[PDB]
Amino acid sequence: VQGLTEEQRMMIRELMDAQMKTFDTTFSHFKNFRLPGVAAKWSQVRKDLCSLKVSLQLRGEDGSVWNYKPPADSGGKEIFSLLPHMADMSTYMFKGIISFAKVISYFRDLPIEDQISLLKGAAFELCQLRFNTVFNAETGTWECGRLSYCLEDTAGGFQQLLLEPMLKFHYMLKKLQLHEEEYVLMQAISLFSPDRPGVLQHRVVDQLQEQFAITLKSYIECNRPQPAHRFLFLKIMAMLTELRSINAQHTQRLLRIQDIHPFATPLMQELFGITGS
Numbered sequence: 001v002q003g004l005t006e007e008q009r010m011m012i013r014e015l016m017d018a019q020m021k022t023f024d025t026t027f028s029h030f031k032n033f034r035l036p037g038v039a040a041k042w043s044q045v046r047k048d049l050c051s052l053k054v055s056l057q058l059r060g061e062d063g064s065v066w067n068y069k070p071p072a073d074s075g076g077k078e079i080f081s082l083l084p085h086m087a088d089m090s091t092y093m094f095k096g097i098i099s100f101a102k103v104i105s106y107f108r109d110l111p112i113e114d115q116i117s118l119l120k121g122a123a124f125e126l127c128q129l130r131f132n133t134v135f136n137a138e139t140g141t142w143e144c145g146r147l148s149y150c151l152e153d154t155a156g157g158f159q160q161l162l163l164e165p166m167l168k169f170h171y172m173l174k175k176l177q178l179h180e181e182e183y184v185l186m187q188a189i190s191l192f193s194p195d196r197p198g199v200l201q202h203r204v205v206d207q208l209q210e211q212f213a214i215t216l217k218s219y220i221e222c223n224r225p226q227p228a229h230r231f232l233f234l235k236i237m238a239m240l241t242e243l244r245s246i247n248a249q250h251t252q253r254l255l256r257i258q259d260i261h262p263f264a265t266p267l268m269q270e271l272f273g274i275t276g277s
């Protein structure tokens with residue numbers, strides 16, 4: 001129930017309300033998305049693209065199932081086949097994240113230039129945090145309603161996958177068995193990083209972030225006494241630091257792939273600083 005102040009409990013209520021209003025957990029309104037059709041840069045792009053191999057499944061409302069197994073790298077443009085779809089899913093998630101931020105009072109009250117700077121800085125991280133809540137660790141599958149993204153069983157097993165930092169993050173974060181309140185506090189802490197590029201109100205954003213972190217620390221103290229949740233707050237704060245690193249890494253991968261194979265949606269260009277010229 002509580003153990004927090006009035007301000008902390010209202011802070012959680014507003015974040016949970018924003019999450020409820022802007023997170024389409026069944027992905028019902030993700031429609032009209034593209035599907036894979038029926039010189040030293042490339043070597044790096046090829047290494048970037050095969051770091052995440054997923055099969056894709058569509059369950060029809062009628063009960064039909066479409067299933068897609070991707071191709072192995074044969075030395076050409078077939079490794080780009082899932083990029084338009086993933087760009088459309090990313091764009092759909094980004095829209096939910098932007099709406100999430102905009103209905104938060106602490107975010108509305110910041111200058112619009114800081115809003116844009118914080119969203120540009122954190123949108124990828126909040127997308128990852130939401131994707132973890134639909135991640136099934138036992139089946140290696142992100143269950144997005146009628147869409148499923150299954151990690152391709154590969155030599156090395158579920159331990160070679162954990163070498164990919166994005167996949168280790170999702171498995172490790174899932175192992176913590178966080179509450180909805182803790183996930184949405186992680187989103188706030190990430191969205192309120194005072195040191196994003198181009199932030200002006202460093203002091204205000206830092207004070208807001210510290211309050212979201214203290215609320216999280218206090219929430220864990222009051223509602224998780226079990227020995228398994230010892231240092232849970234510090235584990236969460238270390239995963240947020242890792243997520244920031246994965247954010248920087250995946251931003252470089254994106255810019256390299258985009259350099260030789262353009263695929264970013266207009267909203268992705270806006271968030272990752274691509275002007276169109």
Ligand SMILES: C[C@]12CC[C@@H]3c4ccc(O)cc4CC[C@H]3[C@@H]1CC[C@@H]2O
Nearest residue numbers: 048049051052086087090250253254
């Ligand atoms: C995850 C990868 C880097 C990050 C890329 C990205 C990065 C941001 C984004 O909004 C969408 C996508 C889809 C393609 C992703 C890539 C597919 C393989 C590569 O590892």
Ligand SMILES: ClC1=C(Cl)[C@]2(Cl)[C@@H]3[C@@H](Cl)[C@@H]4O[C@@H]4[C@@H]3[C@@]1(Cl)C2(Cl)Cl
Nearest residue numbers: 052086087089090128131142149166
């Ligand atoms: Cl890395 C990755 C891919 Cl690719 C998927 Cl399909 C999705 C794309 Cl649309 C966007 O990068 C985020 C997630 C995440 Cl984590 C999953 Cl696996 Cl859900």
